[PDB]
Design a protein around this ligand. Structure first.
Ligand SMILES: CO[C@H]1[C@@H](O)[C@H](O)[C@H](OC[C@@]23C[C@@H]4[C@H](C)CC[C@H]4[C@@]4(C=O)C[C@@H]2C[C@H](C(C)C)[C@@]34C(=O)O)O[C@@H]1C
Ligand SMILES: Nc1nc2c(ncn2[C@@H]2O[C@H](COP(=O)(O)OP(=O)(O)CP(=O)(O)O)[C@@H](O)[C@H]2O)c(=O)[nH]1
Ligand SMILES: [Zn+2]
Lengths: 840, 94, 52, 189
RNA sequence: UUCAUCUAGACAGCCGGACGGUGGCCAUGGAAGUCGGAAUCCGCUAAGGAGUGUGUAACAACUCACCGGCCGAAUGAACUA
């Protein structure tokens, strides 16, 4: 762009600023049409270098033909002011910067379009000719449309149909017909009642099209306008009545509406004789290598082709002619300045979605009016990094005030009201830099509605952020965005030393990109979440370097097995110690599974006074009033799933044995006998004890055995069963292809819960219990059973009950205690009944 | 109201909303049988009943979905008993 | 994609025929002996599996 | 044949004494609401649209109380059926042709006649609007309603009802697949 | 060989219905003519099974059992060597 460095005079001229977002399918045509849009700019390697692909910015983009993220674009465009007042806006300047951002397809990635879609000012989706709408151009455009935004479809690649598919005068008009109609019917799925007028009409100059390889486009205007210089007047008349009617032209110029000539023959296409008979004549004439018809046809349309550029036949005679006819710069960007709003117009209906408070304070007039003099807050979602380790730019957009370099602003957090003193930050900003494709440009001040990079503030926000300086206001939204929390992967460093580089690596990788999520196991382990598979491939591949600095290893994660006993503890168990010192009788009564959801939450927190929890047990659970007799203290860790008994004989015992009996059974109630770890809703009943001495012939290492086989034994005597978690997932999809969801849940040991309707028929999600032990690739095979358009959501809820008999190595539970015992490290599950059942 | 997924009779046209029953297949069984017919069928299965609990069943023939027309209550009582696999209502045909 | 009424022309004449069980010849939509001699006119047939 | 003997007696007992005889050759029918015109016709005249005995319907008039029974022995074709009454038949024929309830065809079966389609409103949500690529009609959504842009044909003479383009044809609600109760022969006594 | 069907119109072939009760009972979130658990039903009848097999995730759209019309006769199974 030749606006170097006049790119500050155009940012204060706020009526001259537009910015968009081109989102489409993957191998589809986004990252070359943008290269024509900046081929207008004098920043690409001009003459010619068509495959610029300014979303490159990195490796693993040019080698693939792909997009992860992309920065903005500066430019300024020249035109006539007669060609610009078709907008309603009172715009004065001639030059227009299109500060262009975008976001790719990839149903895996597709929370990333929201970070660049709740911040942009216009939706420009791209559709193929030969494909029509794909499956996720429409889903990823309608996440979101509820903003509002203005979806202007810009289809492309007519050349692929034009040379390979042997398209005729009728069939390509049927292709635009069924493609454009079948893509604009879906636009009013949830269009609003008044301002949902974004039904794409072609004749209003909306649906421009061309090629990225041949590098051109047009809507009907710029072949109604340079065509309207001849053959009548005017543009709006012959452009308005177009597209179906038609004319005659063998003898007469009557413009009827029918199909029948006066003698009976069919008439014509209105389209392809007016407006694209030169594309059949052009490329059908050129691709037979004729030399008789191309100079004369060059005289048939717009003298001349220049200079050396005659003789280069073979894809250059092809390649240069439509570039001589029109660019996509006076075509598509002409459509952008005609029908797309400025932030001062489009921002008025923008932040009632985004402003959490009621329409009350000074921001409810200074955001609506988007005042450049008012308070200086903004919103920041995505965090683009630069070529260091990562001191990553904050991709921000100011909604109020002219933001300034060298400035002191309050910083807030994700879910925060400024009442309390925790997690609001009061710091200053380093540098305010702008970016075009792969380069940067530092600025000083900007008015509202302008995305800027923001240097150095990245340390003090997590994946999203507001930064206000009128401390009565509220947070800006997080909207409960979209697809894919979703999946889990165990990740571990090798060679036992680079744990600090890993923990800093992923706590900085969390601030890197907001689509991914990371957390810790039940054991404090290192698992990373993900949005799918190829996302974790493309960033968790390069957690190798640029993010951590040490290569790693990948493993599937270990599900938290738990332990349970339920029925009656069949025999009153006994335990004689390896020293002849005591006997233990017991008969354990495993409590109901209501304490599973009734031992954590705020109904009970133990170690209170010993009457209030008696009121809660007798009044809420079903126990007696004599439970105050019964209990003293339990294990493990305070928050154990037990509260101890008294079926001991109430004569003398347990005030000189308790200090090494309640300090003894923590194993096993933190690490258990059958599978290896702890158990819930358990309750041993020690009937009898023995201390045939005093407090000098007992002690620590003599009495900390005492449950040595006791609650091990009578724990394991009844049935016992190992226990699993089972998630509460929901899966959202319309009902074209729901038929795979219920079946694939049925083949993966799942449980249907419900089914829900909605005002329309998209997004019919289903609630499903789905166990963790086969929950790994479930998103992936769900995609294979749906084919894309089904977006899972996955969260933890409860602890269910398994019943496939783990004590005998036969069934599923015996299999997982078997192989999980082999990775546990110890050998077979103990047979016993002479062990743990000493016959006294 | 019904345990079998019940067909109702109401058109949605300008304030017309009152859930009335067409006296369909599982709909006479709710009325004529014991008041545990809407209740006590969550775990139960009960293919039983032979007490002659009515002889004037034909006071719903103008409601019971006109099929055989010319006779009072002949055809329906061997329809139900099998279609009504709860009981049989008669010692007429099993 | 093509028009499904013309799909009822092609798929009837190449796709939705029958198949043998012991030597895997293609058989007409009613047969009871796999006409190739090697399996010996066996009475074991089945439909060829459904489209996609 | 002794179960065909109750095709004798059910044809004997109606051909004894009464007034009229009226055969109807009904190959194509839609049975459901035409034997609700055996429920509005409950007890009026039980039809006998029965077996292949077209030879023995006219042979077995050996009683000759009405010796005009020999009429359909050279009619060994057509799906005959007897109804009778002692009433004027001129009033029942007004209603037994009005049994032109119809349904779609057999997902692609035969067609009666070519049908022209205008631009008439229906008034539903946009349902199958994105499913008009088999026939290919220009049709637009406005005011939350389905409106047809241009007139495109559906069927053609020589070709029949289909499954691609004629599945949605009874979203426009015409009656191709009925072939109602058609008169063959009427006679009194 | 045994058991059957018919020139009183059998068999195959194409034209046709392939219901009302009643989207039968429980079950099932839902299991609507065709999906698990038993039973096992009458009017229209020329016919209808709790339906032969596809079909939506529950529907709606398809194929027969039964017998209507085709034209003029001998066929159908199980077996046996
Ligand atoms: C991302 O949003 C949610 C959901 O994805 C989901 O609820 C997920 O569940 C993870 C688990 C949480 C459980 C508690 C922390 C204690 C036991 C944990 C689990 C067992 O290992 C149960 C689910 C499934 C996970 C594995 C290890 C078995 C858990 C874990 O993270 O360890 O948590 C994140 C935060
Ligand atoms: N024939 C033809 N091929 C094209 C055209 N535009 C792009 N391609 C093909 O697409 C590939 C280049 O990627 P491109 O399509 O431009 O970008 P994209 O598909 O949008 C990449 P992303 O969607 O991830 O941003 C090449 O294989 C190229 O041949 C075009 O106009 N014509
Ligand atoms: Zn063979």
């Amino acid at each position: 762009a030749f606006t170097v460095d006049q790119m500050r005079s155009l940012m204060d001229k706020v009526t001259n600023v537009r910015n968009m977002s081109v989102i489409a399918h993957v191998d589809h045509g986004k990252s070359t049409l943008t290269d024509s849009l900046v081929q207008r700019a004098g920043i690409i390697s001009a003459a010619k270098a068509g495959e610029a692909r300014f979303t490159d910015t990195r490796k693993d983009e040019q080698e693939r033909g792909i997009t992860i993220k992309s920065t903005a674009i500066s430019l300024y465009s020249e035109m006539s002011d007669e060609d610009v007042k078709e907008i309603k806006q009172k715009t004065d300047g001639n030059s227009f910067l299109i500060n262009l951002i975008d976001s790719p397809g990839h149903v895996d990635f597709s929370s990333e379009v929201t970070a660049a879609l709740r911040v942009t000012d216009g939706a420009l989706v791209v559709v193929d000719t030969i494909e029509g709408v794909c499956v996720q151009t429409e889903t990823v455009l309608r996440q979101a449309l509820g903003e509002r935004i203005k979806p202007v479809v810009v289809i492309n690649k007519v050349d692929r149909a034009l040379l390979e598919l042997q398209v005729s005068k009728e069939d390509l008009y049927q292709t635009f017909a069924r493609t454009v109609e079948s893509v604009n019917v879906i636009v009013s799925t949830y269009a609003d009642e008044v301002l949902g007028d974004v039904q794409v009409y072609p004749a209003r100059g909306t649906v421009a099209f061309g090629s990225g390889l041949h590098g051109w486009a047009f809507t009907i205007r710029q072949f109604a306008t340079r065509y309207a210089k001849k053959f009548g007047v005017d543009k709006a008349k012959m452009m308005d009545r177009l597209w179906g009617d038609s004319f005659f032209n063998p003898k007469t110029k009557k413009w009827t509406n029918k199909d029948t000539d006066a003698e009976g023959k069919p008439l014509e296409r209105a389209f392809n004789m007016f407006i694209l008979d030169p594309i059949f004549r052009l490329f059908t004439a050129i691709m037979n290598f004729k030399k008789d018809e191309i100079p004369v046809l060059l005289e048939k349309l717009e003298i001349v082709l220049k200079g050396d550029e005659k003789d280069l036949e073979g894809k250059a005679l092809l390649k240069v002619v439509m570039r001589k006819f029109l660019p996509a710069a006076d075509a598509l960007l002409e459509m952008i300045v005609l029908h797309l709003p400025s932030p001062v117009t489009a921002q008025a209906y923008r932040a009632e979605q985004l402003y959490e408070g009621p329409a009350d304070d000074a921001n409810c007039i200074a955001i609506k009016n988007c005042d450049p003099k008012a308070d200086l807050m903004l919103y920041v979602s995505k965090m683009v990094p630069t070529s260091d380790k990562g001191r990553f730019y904050a991709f921000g957009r100011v909604f109020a005030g002219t933001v300034k370099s060298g400035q002191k602003v309050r910083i807030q957090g994700p879910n925060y009201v400024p009442g309390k003193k925790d997690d609001l930050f009061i710091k200053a900003i380093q540098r305010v830099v702008l970016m075009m494709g792969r380069f940067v440009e530092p600025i000083d001040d900007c008015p509202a509605g302008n995305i800027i990079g923001l240097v150095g503030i990245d340390q003090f926000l997590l994946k999203t952020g507001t930064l206000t300086t009128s401390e009565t206001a509220h947070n800006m939204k997080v909207m409960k965005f979209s697809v894919s929390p979703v999946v889990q992967v165990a990740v571990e460093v090798k060679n036992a030393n680079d744990l600090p580089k890993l923990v800093e690596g992923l706590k900085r990788l969390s601030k890197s990109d907001p689509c991914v999520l990371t957390y810790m196991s039940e054991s404090g382990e290192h698992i990373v979440a993900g949005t799918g598979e190829l996302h974790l491939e493309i960033c968790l591949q390069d957690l190798e370097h640029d993010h951590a600095g040490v290569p790693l290893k990948i493993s599937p994660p270990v599900v938290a097995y738990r332990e349970t006993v339920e029925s009656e503890s069949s025999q009153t168990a006994l335990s004689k110690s390896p020293n002849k010192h005591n006997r233990i009788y017991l008969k354990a009564e495993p409590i109901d599974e209501e304490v599973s959801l009734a031992i954590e939450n705020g109904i009970i927190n133990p170690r209170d006074d010993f009457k209030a929890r008696a009121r809660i047990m007798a009044d809420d659970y079903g126990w007696d009033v004599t439970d105050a007799r019964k209990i003293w203290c339990f294990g493990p860790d305070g928050n154990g799933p037990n509260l101890v008994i008294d079926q001991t004989k109430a004569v003398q015992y347990l005030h000189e044995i308790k200090d090494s009996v309640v300090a003894a059974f923590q194993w096993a109630t933190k690490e258990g006998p059958i599978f290896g770890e702890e158990m819930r809703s358990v309750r041993v009943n020690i009937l009898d004890v023995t201390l045939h001495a005093d407090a000098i012939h007992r002690g620590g290492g003599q009495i900390i055995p005492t449950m040595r086989r006791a609650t091990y034994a009578g724990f394991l005597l009844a049935d016992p069963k190992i226990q699993e978690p089972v998630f509460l997932v929901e899966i959202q999809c319309p009902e074209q292809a729901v038929g795979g969801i219920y079946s694939v849940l049925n083949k993966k040991r799942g449980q249907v819960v419900s089914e829900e309707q909605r005002p329309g028929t998209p997004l019919f999600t289903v609630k499903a219990y789905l166990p963790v032990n086969e929950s790994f690739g479930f998103t992936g095979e769900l995609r294979q059973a749906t084919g894309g358009q089904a977006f899972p959501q996955m969260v933890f809820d409860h602890w269910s009950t398994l019943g496939s008999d783990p004590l005998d190595p036969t069934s599923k539970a015996g299999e997982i205690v078997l192989a999980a015992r082999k990775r546990h490290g110890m050998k077979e599950e103990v047979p016993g009944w002479q062990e743990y059942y000493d016959k006294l | 109201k019904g345990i079998k997924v019940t067909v109702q009779l109401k058109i949605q046209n300008r304030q017309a909303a009152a859930s009335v029953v067409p006296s369909a297949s599982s709909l006479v069984i709710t009325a004529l049988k014991e008041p545990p017919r809407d209740r006590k069928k969550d775990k139960n299965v009960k293919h039983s009943g032979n007490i002659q609990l009515d002889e004037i069943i034909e006071i719903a023939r103008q409601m019971r979905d006109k099929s055989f027309g010319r006779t009072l209550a002949s055809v329906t009582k061997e329809i139900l008993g099998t279609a009504q696999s709860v009981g049989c209502r008669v010692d007429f045909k099993n | 994609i093509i028009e499904p009424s013309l799909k009822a022309l092609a798929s009837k004449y190449n796709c939705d025929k029958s198949v043998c069980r012991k030597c895997y010849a293609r058989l007409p939509p009613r047969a009871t002996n796999c006409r190739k001699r090697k399996c010996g006119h066996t009475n074991q047939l089945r439909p060829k599996k459904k489209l996609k | 044949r002794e179960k065909k003997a109750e095709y004798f007696a059910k044809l004997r007992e109606y051909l004894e004494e009464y007034k009229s005889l009226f055969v109807v050759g009904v190959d194509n029918v839609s049975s459901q609401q035409m034997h609700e015109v055996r429920k509005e016709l409950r007890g009026r005249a039980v039809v006998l649209m029965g077996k292949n005995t077209m030879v023995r319907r006219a042979i077995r008039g050996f009683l000759s109380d009405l010796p005009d029974f020999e009429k359909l022995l050279p009619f060994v074709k057509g799906n005959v059926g007897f109804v009778f009454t002692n009433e004027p038949l001129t009033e029942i024929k007004n209603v037994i042709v009005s049994n032109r309830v119809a349904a779609p065809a057999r997902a692609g079966a035969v067609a009666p006649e070519d049908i022209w389609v205008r631009a008439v409103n229906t008034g539903m949500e946009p349902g199958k609007t994105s499913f008009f690529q088999a026939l290919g009609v220009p049709t637009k959504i406005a005011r939350g309603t389905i409106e047809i842009v241009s007139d495109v044909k559906v069927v053609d003479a020589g070709n029949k009802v289909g499954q691609s383009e004629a599945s949605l044809l009874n979203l426009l609600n015409i009656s191709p697949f009925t072939f109602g109760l058609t008169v063959v022969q009427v006679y009194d006594n």
